[PDB]
Amino acid sequence: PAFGMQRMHYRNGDPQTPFQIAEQQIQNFQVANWLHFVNNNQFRQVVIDGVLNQVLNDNIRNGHVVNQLMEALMQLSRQQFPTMPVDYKRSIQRGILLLSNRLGQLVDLTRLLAYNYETLMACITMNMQHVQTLTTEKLQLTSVTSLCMLIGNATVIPSPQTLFHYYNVNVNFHSNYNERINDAVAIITAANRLNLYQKKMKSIVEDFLKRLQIFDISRVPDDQMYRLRDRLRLLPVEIRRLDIFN
Amino acid sequence: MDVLYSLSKTLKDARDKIVEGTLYSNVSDLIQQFNQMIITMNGNEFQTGGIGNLPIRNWNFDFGLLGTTLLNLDANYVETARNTIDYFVDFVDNVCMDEMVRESQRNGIAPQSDSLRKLSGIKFKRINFDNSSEYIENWNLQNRRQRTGFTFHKPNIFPYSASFTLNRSQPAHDNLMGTMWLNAGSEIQVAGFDYSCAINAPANIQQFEHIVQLRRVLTTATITLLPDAERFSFPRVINSADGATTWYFNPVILRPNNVEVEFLLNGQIINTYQARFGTIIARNFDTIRLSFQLMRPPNMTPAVAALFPNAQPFEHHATVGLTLRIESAVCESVLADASKTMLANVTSVRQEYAIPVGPVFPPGMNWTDLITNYSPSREDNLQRVFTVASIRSMLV
Amino acid sequence: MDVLYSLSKTLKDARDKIVEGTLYSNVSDLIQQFNQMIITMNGNEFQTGGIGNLPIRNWNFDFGLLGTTLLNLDANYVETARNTIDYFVDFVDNVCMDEMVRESQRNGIAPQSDSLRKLSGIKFKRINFDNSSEYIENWNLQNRRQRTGFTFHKPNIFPYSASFTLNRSQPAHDNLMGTMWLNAGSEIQVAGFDYSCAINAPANIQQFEHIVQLRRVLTTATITLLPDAERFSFPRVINSADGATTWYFNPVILRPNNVEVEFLLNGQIINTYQARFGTIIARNFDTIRLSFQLMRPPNMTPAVAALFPNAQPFEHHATVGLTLRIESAVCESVLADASKTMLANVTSVRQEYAIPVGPVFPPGMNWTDLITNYSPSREDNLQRVFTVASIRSMLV
Amino acid sequence: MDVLYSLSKTLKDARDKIVEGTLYSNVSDLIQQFNQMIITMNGNEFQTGGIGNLPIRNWNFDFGLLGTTLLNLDANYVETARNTIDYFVDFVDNVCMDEMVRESQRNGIAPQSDSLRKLSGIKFKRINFDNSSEYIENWNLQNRRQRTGFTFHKPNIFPYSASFTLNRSQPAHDNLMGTMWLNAGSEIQVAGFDYSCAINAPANIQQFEHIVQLRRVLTTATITLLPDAERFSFPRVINSADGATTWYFNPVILRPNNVEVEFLLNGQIINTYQARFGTIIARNFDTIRLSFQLMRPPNMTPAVAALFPNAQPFEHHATVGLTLRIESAVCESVLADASKTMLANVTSVRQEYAIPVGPVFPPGMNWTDLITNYSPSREDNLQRVFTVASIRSMLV
Amino acid sequence: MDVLYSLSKTLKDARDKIVEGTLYSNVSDLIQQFNQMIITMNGNEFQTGGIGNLPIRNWNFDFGLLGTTLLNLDANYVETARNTIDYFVDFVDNVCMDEMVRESQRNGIAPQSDSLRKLSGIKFKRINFDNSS
């Protein structure tokens, strides 16, 4: 509407997002460049200390890209909105400028968000695998509005004790996960090598999941339980347990 | 054709007007026209070339509109517009080259290249806007069955012909009466020569006539008529009509007598000029009749009397002449002329890409052969390619 | 240049459109452009310089905007606009004159006058609008290093040269073989003369070749080629190459044999026309090679056989000719031609104010000297002054 | 061109800087540029090579990005980068080869291959960054029509020419006066020989001249001028000017007298050196005029007196010589030279893939023919292919 | 000399790097150096001398800073930068020419022209950066 363009008749399942189509269909450099950044601001993957990490574009980390956003929306505040009734146009442009005129606060907020993310990610020990999950965390855009309009200039970083606690909990969870995997694999392999053909590996898998402490086993689907059994069978036994078994 | 011209005109206006610093009010209508062009061309695939050495080129149109609001154009606006304009100008140039290299005996006025045939679809009619050039204006007027007119400075209406007719002759070619002429372009030099100087002609007058039939009617024609023909007034060893031998011509120029230029239409006299020289106006004619007489001077000085004996041998041959130059005319059909480059553009495009000779035009687009046999199919194809060449000239 | 051109274009639009009774909607965009020009120029002091006899003139701009209140323009509105326009036209004409009379060897394309240098500042870019003239279009394309095109009717590409070459000669000048040519403007007239009529030639053929190098590449050229050379077909008394004596020429014109016209680019053959006369097209070339032959007629009637003996003396010298007129062409460089008035305007302005000779142009703006030594610096300065002359002729 | 250069420069910087163990702050900007390149190229299909034997190759991009938050690059990071770098280097090399083997008469400066035409799109402009090489800098300045020059060590400005001129001659070729010269690369060796040793010349001084017209202006040129021509200082048997007979040259070298070098531009004297040998500076010139003189030594020792008798036969021929070597210069146009590989690279690519001869360059990329007929269109195409060759040599 | 060299090096880097479409991260340090140059030069008058036929030229610096806040450089940015860069390049070229045509018997290593002597002041030392040639 700002550029007088015909509204996008978007189609679900299109390999292109609406912003990817807009980037090609918009000629203004401010808006097109901000759109290009949005279209490509996906996580980059990098392994640090043997842990896969999802890391941000450097322009997010230093907050420079907010300027580009500012540029784009300043352009949107100058646009005619050809057929738009003028009171609604004024309201839209003034809200655009409400976000626009917080450029310094938004750059500070982006830098703060990125720094907190990086510092806390340093404490992660298991690979940050990116998957589209069954359920989501619902984020209200009104809360985004609150954060954007209310953030000041008071820097808040994780406390060293908070970082140590987060890292310790991550390490404890990772270590327990590995130890329960080893226990389950050792028992399954012992039962098989002892020719315990009436043994149900399902109970072993359930005990393993229960010892992981974060699963309500009654709500684990059967196909995933059997897949877990199959994957546990393929793993080799840890040396100490295998020696005891021998 | 109207759509291709509209594309080219939009691109030319965009080039000339979308410039850094200019007021947006200078371009608002142009910006809307340009955006309409973009909308209409979007999502369409075109193919050009594939004939002779003209390369195959594919064109896909996915461009955004210009929606930015400004008081004055800046560099960003100009660069975006320039990218779009460059792609469109290349496409239009290729479509024009593709249409210029093609011909058909049937429906030679109709589009021949696939891209122009596609552009003739109804969906592209939205691109169409101001059709103000002489060639596109004539195209539209003709499509409306309205009388069109192409103005020509020095129309190339006469096919090249340097000929002669001998009315009295003999194997020695020493007592010859006849005419020699050059009809070239917009110029006609003619000269009637009598070797005996009309010594024995009735009343001592030898009458010469020269009829030149124009392949198309000319109107509003400004003609310069001069008494003498400088091309046939110097000694000349000319070939025999069959080429067996050569004869000698030793002109001595007398002023032509009873000069009558008749401009005729369907054999009826439209304009007549008697003993008039300089600028004359032939309003509407398809034929020119030049009648001029060699009149033996009744009273001679001894030097003159010695040049014209009573009997053979005849050394000084009495020649009267005429020069007729069409400076400007109007023709309903397209023609080559001295000021325009449409023929040259078409010929250049056909020669550069090695276009094989087709079933409509002569090889190399030779103008003499083309205008000698200026058939209706040839005329249709020529108007098509000339309109396309004028559209191409706007951008290339 | 673009700013000065835009000023002149705005003034021309105002003169043509701000007329009594006209709808304000006819002029609204023009009024906005004009008021933008007024706003941009207000408060700026200009001096048009005192080179030669051009008076030093000072220019101050403190004008009010043109009104927007009338539905139809009345006489009062036209008079106020006329006053402002008259001052602005005086200024633009003076700036154009001050630019035309200046030249530079180092950067001759850049502005030389102080006012045009000031107008190149960014603050004046707001004035810039539609650049639709051929010369401003070429200026902008050249600034972007794009393919420029200047279309010329009868381009003055050949420097004036009336010369002859004698391949065979003797102190008495009675058995002469060679060529004489006039290269003038867009015309070439060449003539090969053999006094013995190729009696002792290897096959009774005397070959003549004429090479004309064009100072610039010509394209899309329409060329009339005619057999005879009327300029070298009458008796002449000609100075010897050293001016010591005078020789006699008594031409008799034979039909040129094996006429081959080559148009060459970089020494490579681009266009070839053999035994073709009338209109031909040379698509892209910088050299013309005209090869023709005086072929002794194998058969002669007694008069012809008498003109050409077997040995000296020779009274009738066998001459073959060729005439080559460039009717229209396209060149990437500016040139004088038979239609445009750029050269005449620049020369008239330089002579009217007695501009001292400078380090670029010949000391009369004489075209033969200029085109003979058409250096890149000369081309740059000439393009600048011709563009300024076109801008001036929009108003004056 | 800027985009292709930026791609190649990014790949070179990735090869040099993305190395094991390096601080991320060393590579952050480069990693950002590299990722922008990946993003811009992802999802784009390219086709290179459909000319000569250059095989058709298709390029698709679906590459992942590189991390942005580690402190030091490790081997894992470099391995992640290297495969993408290899694919991109292959693509850039093929795009460069595709462009190098193509030419056009109309717009030789504009891109010719499909891939470089697609890379001219606005979307790819994001890849563009530091244009610091001499060729790309000259490309960008030349697009803006700014003054910019290429610096050449031993520029190959002279087309190969080993010729002689005889001012005094006769069929026996035993008393000859004239000059013989080699023009090759940046070297002029000229030698004036008098067989009679100017015995009967006025003042016993024989003047020799040699003019070499450079096809392009050289500026700020360093010249070595030595007073002998070792190339024309030993006995030779030389064909005649028509090849009908061979004559004999038996030089004896005398020091050249009144040695004058005039470096001229547009026929104006710019630099003048008299009796100066060693290093001289020619700031701006297109022509070199060497004037030298053989003076009879007024006093001769008995052997020297025997060498040169008062009259024929002349067995020892007095020769004076000059050698002129352009060590370095600046030219606004591109040239071959002793240091660069651009010409060699383009020739190698054209020969390895059997590129058919086009309409711009001489076959086999022969430099003598190319610099003999160095037209503006040839200059455009050569600058394009030489810039592409420099871009290619950044990676290959 | 180092200040004149740093001016020229900054201008050359700006001409090579401030190009349309480029990432701002490619030019951030260059933009900072360029703005430092503009700030140091603003308000200063220079006269390049009339030795020989070299024309007397006067130079005044009142320029705006190059902008930040773009992710990619656009055409407006390049145009503004080009105007400033062209003026600066003309000034530096004239200073170099004015220095190249002068000489003194003693202290011939020291600057000779007025502009280069002015540029040897402490206030211009801020311009100085990478001396790599």
Ligand SMILES: [Cl-]
């Ligand atoms: Cl060397």
Ligand SMILES: [Zn+2]
């Ligand atoms: Zn006959």
Ligand SMILES: [Zn+2]
């Ligand atoms: Zn003579």
Ligand SMILES: [Zn+2]
């Ligand atoms: Zn070397």
Ligand SMILES: [Zn+2]
């Ligand atoms: Zn010889």
